[PDB]
Amino acid sequence: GWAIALHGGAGDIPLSLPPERRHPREEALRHCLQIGVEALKAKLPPLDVVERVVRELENIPQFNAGKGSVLTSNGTVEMEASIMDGTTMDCGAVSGLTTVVNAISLARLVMEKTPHIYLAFDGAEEFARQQGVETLDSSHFITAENIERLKQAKEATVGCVAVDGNGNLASATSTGGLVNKMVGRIGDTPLIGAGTYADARCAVSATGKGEAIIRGTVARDVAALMEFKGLSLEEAATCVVHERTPKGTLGLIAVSAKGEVAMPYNTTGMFRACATEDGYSEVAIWPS
Amino acid sequence: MGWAIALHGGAGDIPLSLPPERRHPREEALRHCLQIGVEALKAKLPPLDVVERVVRELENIPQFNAGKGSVLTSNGTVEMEASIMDGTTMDCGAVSGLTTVVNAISLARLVMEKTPHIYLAFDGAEEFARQQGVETLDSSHFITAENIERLKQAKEANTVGCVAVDGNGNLASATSTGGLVNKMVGRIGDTPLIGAGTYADARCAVSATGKGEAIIRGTVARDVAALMEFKGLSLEEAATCVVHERTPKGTLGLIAVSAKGEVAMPYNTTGMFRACATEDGYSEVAIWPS
Ligand SMILES: [Cl-]
Ligand SMILES: [Cl-]
Ligand SMILES: [Cl-]
Ligand SMILES: [Cl-]
Ligand SMILES: [Cl-]
Ligand code: NA
Ligand code: NA
Ligand code: NA
Ligand code: NA
């Protein structure tokens, strides 16, 4: 049957995270899970499901994508996303977005409306205007929390995977990237086979230290272990997270064509949720 | 078995009737650039320096779609991209959106060496280039008469690389391109994406060429390495499986070397401008199938 997983990012989420900051993030996870489950039960194809959920996770200011993107070194927002359809292996990606309200929707339009997969920076902003997507002033995306985070860094990702009852799979990832990143830095989120992958067998969205995820080709590696060694989703995701990538760098979510779900992480925490047709659902931050 | 090097000047529908005056300089360029890599490997230059030196020269040859001679965007502009990977460390570097940088591959290497990042693109990459003091020239330098005409033909109708291994099994890959003629401004292809156009690990080094979007979707360079690592396929078995089973005909060619000094250069296109050499005394320059 159908299955959905989502994340609001992996990293060093401290156990002492105050309730005032925990609660809104938990509420956001549970609300996005309800949106994605409602969508699958309304017979929306998995590509529409992961777009719809990641649009919400972009709009949530407590998550690093869309509004609440982390700031470049220059105190600016540069947003990036990718989307992949497992059944066609069609895909779309964008980098260097500064005014586009929903980066993941622009990635979808590159896939549908152009002969290309990947547009970035000024050409991606020009395509956004040609398509008439929603834009706001760059100041919309910058939060007080992210101004402070950049100050402290100089001193010192969201995702959705879904499968319907017919084995159709999709993956969507969106980010502001890494605090204090150099202007023009591209991380793992928009790279097919790093942050995002979907094929006949699985759909994967990765989150964490961008450069490690690129070097590790994490999303492709999950799919490759299932295809080339006959590993189950759980075996393939476990091996990548706990065997092949360094501690404190990576988490991912994955669903299979058979409707299984895996959300392993090697970080302290990962803001995560999932639901299956088989009546499993969970919302979590830390290990249980 | 000792050192080995392979290089390409791109794969695609190179017609069997390609007249001598387009074939000639490209075959000579392959032989010239192979000499650069052979002399470097005979001098025991690290593979990462070998592939950078060869691809710099391939960028400079105006008949190849990289550096000077890069194909034109829809707007008649050059937007250049490159990636480089060290198989021993899996250290890598990538650049997209370069308009004035003479050698894209060398800025990919500086990202890897001088920053905490793998990949810089467009204004931020051009600004890193200026901080680093690398050679830049006016955007008009990169535009050739041949590519003005190619773009005119594309609107009407509507890659280079090097892999090297030393006798100690150290592996490197480098790939540089103008991209696709009449591409939208800001379009990124496979060349700068680690695991699509470029990959190196302890077992192999891979550079891919052909239709960017097919190579992204097929994660070609990573797939060769994954079949060797996860199925125990030879370099040849893995390379041939990717090109002749896992990807559409007419889209892709690749060059690859193994830790053991094996060479493979399969393609599913009409042709692929290619050359290789091994310490065992083999060398080859070719365009079409034998
Ligand atoms: Cl990142
Ligand atoms: Cl010519
Ligand atoms: Cl020089
Ligand atoms: Cl390309
Ligand atoms: Cl051959
Ligand atoms: Na957000
Ligand atoms: Na497309
Ligand atoms: Na050139
Ligand atoms: Na680096």
UniProtKB/TrEMBL annotation, chain A:
Tagged with keyword Protease: yes
EC number annotated for this UniProt entry: 3.4.19.5
InterPro entries, per database record: Ntn_hydrolases_N (IPR029055), Peptidase_T2 (IPR000246)
Key words of the record: Autocatalytic cleavage, Hydrolase, Protease
Reaction it catalyzes: Cleavage of a beta-linked Asp residue from the N-terminus of a polypeptide
CDD domains attached to this UniProt entry: Asparaginase_2 (cd04701)
Gene Ontology biological-process annotations: proteolysis
UniProt entry tagged with the keyword Protease: yes
Subunit structure comment from the entry: Heterotetramer of two alpha and two beta chains arranged as a dimer of alpha/beta heterodimers.
GO molecular function annotation: asparaginase activity; beta-aspartyl-peptidase activity
Annotated residues for binding of substrate: 185-188, 207-210
Record-annotated active site: 157
Annotated source species: Phaseolus vulgaris
Name of this protein: beta-aspartyl-peptidase
